[PDB]
Write a protein that binds this ligand. Structure first.
Ligand SMILES: COC(=O)N[C@H](C(=O)N[C@@H](Cc1ccccc1)[C@@H](O)CN(Cc1ccc(-c2ccccn2)cc1)NC(=O)[C@@H](NC(=O)OC)C(C)(C)C)C(C)(C)C
Lengths: 99, 99
């Protein structure tokens, strides 16, 4: 859909049959989700915004469902205040910014 | 434009004769610029990124130009790595997320 920015662009995502609320974020290189167990090998990583960096676990080739759109790619898991769909996944659903 | 997210959505902003590079950021409630002097009164705010909070100075009714779109609103100044155009000014240019 075409979506407004008068409110935060929160959408429902599906991961491992977990239902979660996540932010569509054009200012995020990566996708970062709050703490959750995902199966498989992961590598340690740090990511940062304002305020400093956080340590996360990097899971590759994770399926996610974003508003009826089934993508698979890299998911970071760690102490993020909120679930964040960054450009790696936004790209996979043909999401653009428009004005 | 219809901006793909295959790269970071970096654009030119003009603020008081200063040209700057800034990131179109749907994950940001607020617009946050790196350290600069701005005219007028200001209030301290605290804003929260991924790593925690920073203190900024809030300037109200600051004219800003985004891709030659003339906009006026709240601009926060402080220790950000990158000039961030948040939703307060993205809504002013009629910006939507499309997928
Ligand atoms: C290359 O680095 C990045 O891309 N960093 C990303 C990042 O932090 N992006 C920032 C912008 C940014 C880019 C590059 C360097 C530094 C910062 C934002 O897109 C997402 N970010 C991360 C973030 C987003 C939301 C929230 C949040 C908190 C409480 C409730 C809802 N959301 C917290 C952190 N948002 C905020 O930090 C904003 N915060 C905000 O809008 O808070 C209400 C600010 C900006 C206004 C402070 C991620 C770690 C998410 C991948």
């Amino acid at each position: 859909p075409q979506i407004t920015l008068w409110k935060r662009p929160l959408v429902t995502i599906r991961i491992g049959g977990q239902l979660k609320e996540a932010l569509l974020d054009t200012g995020a290189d990566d996708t970062v989700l709050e703490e959750m167990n995902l199966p498989g090998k992961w590598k340690p990583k740090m990511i940062g915004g304002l305020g400093g960096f956080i340590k996360v676990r990097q899971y590759d080739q994770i399926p996610v469902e974003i508003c009826g759109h089934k993508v698979i790619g890299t998911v970071l898991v760690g102490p993020t205040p909120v679930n964040i769909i960054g450009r790696n996944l936004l790209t996979q659903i043909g999401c653009t910014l428009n004005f």
